[PDB]
Amino acid sequence: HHMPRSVTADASGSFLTLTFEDGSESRFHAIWLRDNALDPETRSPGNGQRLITIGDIPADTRISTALVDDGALTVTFAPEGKTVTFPGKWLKSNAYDTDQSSEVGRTSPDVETWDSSQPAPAFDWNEVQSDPKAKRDWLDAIARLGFAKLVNGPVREGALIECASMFGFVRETNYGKYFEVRTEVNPTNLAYTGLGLQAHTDNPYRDPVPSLQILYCLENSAEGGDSIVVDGFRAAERLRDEDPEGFALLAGNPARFEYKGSDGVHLRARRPMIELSPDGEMIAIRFNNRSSAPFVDIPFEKMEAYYAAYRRLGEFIDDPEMGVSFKLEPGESFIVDNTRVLHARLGYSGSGSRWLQGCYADKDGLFSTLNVLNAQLG
Amino acid sequence: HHMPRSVTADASGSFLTLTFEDGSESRFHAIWLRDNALDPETRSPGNGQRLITIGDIPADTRISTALVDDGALTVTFAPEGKTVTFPGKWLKSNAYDTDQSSEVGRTSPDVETWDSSQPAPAFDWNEVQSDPKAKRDWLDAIARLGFAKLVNGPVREGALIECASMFGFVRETNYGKYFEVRTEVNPTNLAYTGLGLQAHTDNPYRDPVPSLQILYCLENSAEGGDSIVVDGFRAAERLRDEDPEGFALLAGNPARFEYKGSDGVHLRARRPMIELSPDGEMIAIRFNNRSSAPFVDIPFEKMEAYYAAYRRLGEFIDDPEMGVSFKLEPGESFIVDNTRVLHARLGYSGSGSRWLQGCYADKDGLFSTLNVLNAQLG
């Protein structure tokens, strides 16, 4: 099935049809094959960079001659007269003559959505540093599920920056490379500190949104206040399955977010609460009650139904059965994919203090590190 | 103009229609007005953040009474019995009943597109550093035009980091805090050679894409090495106006991008070459011949047309009448909005030396700095 058997070219030379040993067929256009040639004059052997532009490829490029031999495809292009070969495995892996799904709001096959039945993934600080398999599994959990907990870390200021550096790079803001989250819980504030905060993604007013968030515990002597995570993709899925028109409104119209502090910070963004790829795949969630700004982009005739959908998404986010809760002891931390997984805490149940440190990092670095680890372990 | 004259409420109480003194009308829904109330129980007086969730607003919310007085609208909401006042100017500025354009591929009102007919805007290093009016003008140019030169700067290694610090924060990547743009033996990227490069946006394989790039000249004494910038929005507009089907193909299907230039890095992204907001406004351009990966997300029946559109976009990008060309002197630099404005360079050779330094920053910080300067200067 990854082993090519034979090939036929069209009389035009505009495409060819590759038949594999299992009977399956896959068609490839001449232009696509020429642009994706893997030979040293198309792709630099040293760095993999393509050496030619689309403009460099003759617009009348066609397949002149083609043949399957010993697991590979030989193709010669006219009018260049250029012969290249493609390994069979590569052609199958990079095929586009497939039945690509067009389901609106579908999740990527790489991710798995969850509710309160999902245990919090937990990994050991020392093991992820010394065991590449543990590191791979830690980062893979953040990739697939959008969060993971790291335990047995050092009780040291700035330790979260060391965590970030294990896979990527910190998104520095006006607040610094990291920020302090100090809480004092006492009878004078327990009326409000004793209630939970609505789950949210951080900084939807930043474009580009910081794509990972790390929260790291240094001190905890206050009862309750468990951290909680909610899968924005699951909330969005539930809306879509119940109410596809409401989902389409939240995906089809941008919201506005703003943070205009008294500390000389003024951040604004214009993005939808549910962000889809142009072919319908769900790629990001932005939900934060505190920084939502006037919605000026939604037409008058859609505003009521938009608000109804918005309210419904909030109910799914507020649903106790959607939240995964956990304790953070000193030296423990968690990361969330801040383009997907919302976070908050439950109410505090007793007096004391807490000291967390917070920072942002970016997913591209995490995915790169994961890719490198998979290649090293594969 | 923004002075309310009169108001009518709908029979349902679901919206009101505000008539201003110039005869213009604007409708506002009960739910939208309630959610946007500016009073101390809905919005913090200290930081302007929202103190309610969408779920806190009653399900039955409607307008019980509404009156115009002292250039403002006073509205009472049932069932809360909550009365709030909206200034006339606030209502005009935050109106959504504005007959929003649905022109696909339109640019934001805040940007202005360009070609080779406008000389490069240039600002002075010492002026932007000391004079906040000059800084504001420089940053506003980058915001509106996506491009500005900064000249008469220091011939010093790392000076670009000082430049970044004038408005925001460096996005550190695999390439470093900053990178050395010079010929390297065993280059990790074709930028590190003497070759000419087609106009491109940096790192389309990175998601999130770096939103700003700084390029800073230390040496440019070889024959060639001229810089060219191209407005990707202008190129996209031309394709839109000439060939709406081709524009739709590039906006409606994701491309793939990949960089694996050495061991220890493997960056991938799945994004369209033309990114639109869900309401059709142009958001971003991603275009890079060197790191475009096999396009696997485009149906077989659309791939030929997709490539034709990609070719045509490339022709607009390569058009000499689109490119703004200059050769940097030591201590001169430029910034591009890397989500919009492409940069290129001509190959260099012979005696002499070329040495540029590059780094990434983010637009969110630039806009905040600009927003703060605008407040402080008026």
Ligand SMILES: C[N+](C)(C)C[C@H](O)P(=O)(O)O
């Ligand atoms: C090497 N680099 C200058 C940092 C990036 C390249 O210009 P690319 O974004 O085209 O790969």
Ligand SMILES: [Fe+2]
């Ligand atoms: Fe938060």
Ligand SMILES: [Fe+2]
């Ligand atoms: Fe570049």
